[PDB]
C-alpha cells in the first residue's frame, strides 16, 4: 500500500493570505508511461461531499478559482490556495491514483481567521411536556462567535455544575467563518424542582468580561 | 447534471449483509471508472473499491478484501457495494464517485451503522423564545434519546434556512443521542411568524412537526 501523509493536521489563515498544504507519497505517484504524477486533491467542506480540486498533481478541474494550485514531482506534493475565502473553509485531502488502493492522506483541517467576534448567549428552561417525562434539560446557545475558544459554565442557585452537562459546537460557517456552540444541562425532574435560579455564564475573547443568561424557574 | 445517488445503508447487526447502490444519471455510465470510498462521520476519507469500465477489474482497501464485492450493471446505469461480515469499524458513510481524471460527481452517501443497538426514535422538545439580543431572537428544537444517526431537521418544511444551525448529534451516558437545532429570526417577527422544526429519524419511522411558540 502507498501511504500519503499530509501536513500540516491544522492550519489557520487568514483571508486574503496563502495556505500551503503538504502531502508526502511512501513511493513515487509518477507514471512514466502517462508523463503524469497521478495525485488528486479535494476540498470538502463542512456537511458535504468531496470536491475534486486538482488531479495529475497539477491539473484544475473545470470551475475551480485559479487560486487552488498543485505542485511537485515524485513524493513531494503541494497545494497553495491563495487569497484564501470565507468558502475555503474545509478539510483538504490528497489521494494517490497510481496503484489500488487508491488511499487518501490524512486530511488537513483549513480554519479562516476572522477578527474577534463576541458569541449572542441563549438560555432556555425545560420545556412543560419535557418535564412530564421526568428529565429536565437546560439549554445555553452561544451563537457566531470567534475565535473557537469559549467556557461555559452552569450555576444552580450559585452551585458551578460538573459531570451534567455536554457541549456541542458546529464546523466554522462558510460565510461569515464563525462558530456556534451549545451546553446542555440535564437533571432529573426532582433535582430540577429542588433549585430557583439557573443560569449559564459564557467566558470569550470578544466579552470585555464574562457574560450570564439565566431565569428563574416557573417565572 | 452528472448525478451520483446511494442507497441500501441503515443500521445493521455486526456479522451481518448489506447491498449499497449508486445510480449514476447524465453522463455514459460504462465509460468510466467507478469508487467507493467510506468516512467514519468526523474521521477523514478512507478507499474501499472501484471497478473498470466492464467490471473485468476490480481491487479493495485490505481491511475489507473478502468481506465486500463491487459490481456494476451498465444497462441499468448502477454501481453495487455487497457488505458481508460486517464490524464496527465499517460503519461510516458510504459515497460513490465517478473515475476521470480524479474521484467526480461525488453523491450526497448513505450512512451505514454497524450495531447490535435497537432503533430508537426522538423525543423533540420546544426551546422557546422568551422576553429576553436587542433585535435578535433565537428559538429552537431539542431532539433527544434516538439511535441510530441519523435524525434531519429543517425549519417551515425547508423556507427557514438563514440563521439555522443544526448542531453535531452527541451521544450520551445512555448511549443514546441527542442534538438541538436553533435559529435566530428578527425579534419582530415574533409575534406573526409561525416557526415549526420538521424532524425526521428516518431509522424509526419518526416524523414531527414541532411549532415552537414564544414564552
Ligand atoms: C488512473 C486513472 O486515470 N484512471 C482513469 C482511466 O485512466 C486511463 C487508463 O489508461 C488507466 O491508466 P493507469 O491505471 O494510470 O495505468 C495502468 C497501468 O497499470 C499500466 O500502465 C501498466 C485512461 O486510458 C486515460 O484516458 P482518458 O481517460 O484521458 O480518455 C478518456 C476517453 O475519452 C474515454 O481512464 C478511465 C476512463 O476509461 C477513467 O474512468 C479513470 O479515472
Ligand atoms: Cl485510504
Known amino acids: 500500500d502507498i501511504q500519503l501523509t499530509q501536513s500540516p493536521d491544522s492550519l489557520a489563515v487568514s483571508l486574503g493570505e496563502r495556505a500551503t498544504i503538504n502531502c508526502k507519497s511512501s513511493?513515487?505517484?509518477?507514471?512514466?508511461?502517462?508523463?503524469?504524477?497521478?495525485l488528486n486533491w479535494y476540498q470538502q467542506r463542512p456537511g458535504q461531499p468531496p470536491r475534486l480540486l486538482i488531479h495529475?498533481?497539477?491539473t484544475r478541474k473545470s470551475g475551480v478559482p485559479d487560486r487552488f494550485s498543485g505542485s511537485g514531482f515524485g513524493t513531494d506534493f503541494t497545494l497553495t490556495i491563495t487569497s484564501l475565502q470565507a468558502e475555503d473553509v474545509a478539510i483538504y485531502y490528497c489521494?494517490?491514483?497510481?496503484?489500488?488502493?487508491?488511499?487518501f492522506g490524512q486530511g488537513t483541517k483549513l480554519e479562516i481567521k476572522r477578527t474577534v467576534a463576541a458569541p449572542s448567549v441563549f438560555i432556555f428552561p425545560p420545556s412543560d411536556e419535557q418535564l412530564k417525562s421526568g428529565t429536565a434539560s437546560v439549554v445555553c446557545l452561544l451563537n457566531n462567535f470567534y475565535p473557537r475558544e469559549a467556557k461555559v459554565q452552569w450555576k444552580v442557585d450559585n452551585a458551578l455544575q460538573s459531570g451534567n452537562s455536554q457541549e456541542s459546537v458546529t464546523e466554522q460557517d462558510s460565510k461569515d467563518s464563525t462558530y456556534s456552540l451549545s451546553s446542555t444541562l440535564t437533571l432529573s425532574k426532582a433535582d430540577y424542582e429542588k433549585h430557583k435560579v439557573y443560569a449559564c455564564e459564557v467566558t470569550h475573547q470578544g466579552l470585555s468580561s464574562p457574560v450570564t443568561k439565566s431565569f428563574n424557574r416557573g417565572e | 447534471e452528472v448525478q451520483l445517488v446511494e442507497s441500501g445503508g441503515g443500521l445493521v447487526q455486526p456479522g451481518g449483509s448489506l447491498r449499497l447502490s449508486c445510480s449514476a444519471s447524465?453522463?455514459?455510465?460504462?465509460?468510466?471508472?467507478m469508487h467507493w470510498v467510506r468516512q467514519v462521520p468526523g474521521k477523514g476519507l478512507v478507499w474501499i473499491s472501484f471497478?473498470?469500465?466492464?467490471?473485468?477489474?476490480?481491487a479493495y482497501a485490505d481491511s475489507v478484501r473478502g468481506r465486500f464485492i463491487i459490481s456494476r450493471d451498465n444497462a441499468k446505469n448502477t454501481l453495487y457495494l455487497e457488505m458481508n461480515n460486517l464490524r464496527g469499524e465499517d460503519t461510516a458513510v458510504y459515497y460513490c464517485?465517478?473515475?476521470?481524471?480524479?474521484?467526480?460527481?461525488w453523491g450526497q452517501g448513505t450512512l451505514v451503522t454497524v450495531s447490535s443497538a435497537s432503533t430508537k426514535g426522538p423525543s423533540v422538545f420546544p426551546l422557546a423564545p422568551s422576553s429576553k439580543s436587542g433585535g435578535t431572537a433565537a428559538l429552537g428544537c431539542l431532539v433527544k434519546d434516538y439511535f441510530p444517526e441519523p435524525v434531519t431537521v429543517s425549519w417551515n418544511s425547508g423556507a427557514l434556512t438563514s440563521g439555522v444551525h443544526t448542531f453535531p448529534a452527541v451521544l450520551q451516558s445512555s448511549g443514546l443521542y441527542s442534538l438541538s437545532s436553533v435559529v435566530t429570526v428578527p425579534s419582530s417577527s415574533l409575534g406573526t411568524q409561525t416557526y415549526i422544526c420538521n424532524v425526521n429519524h428516518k431509522p424509526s419511522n419518526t416524523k414531527v412537526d414541532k411549532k415552537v411558540e414564544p414564552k
Open positions: 464517485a465517478r473515475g476521470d481524471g480524479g474521484l467526480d460527481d
Open positions: 447524465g453522463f455514459s455510465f460504462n465509460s468510466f471508472w
Open positions: 471497478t473498470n469500465n466492464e467490471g473485468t477489474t476490480t
Open positions: 513511493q513515487s505517484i509518477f507514471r512514466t508511461s502517462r508523463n503524469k504524477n497521478l
Open positions: 495529475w498533481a497539477s
Open positions: 489521494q494517490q491514483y497510481f496503484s489500488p488502493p487508491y488511499t
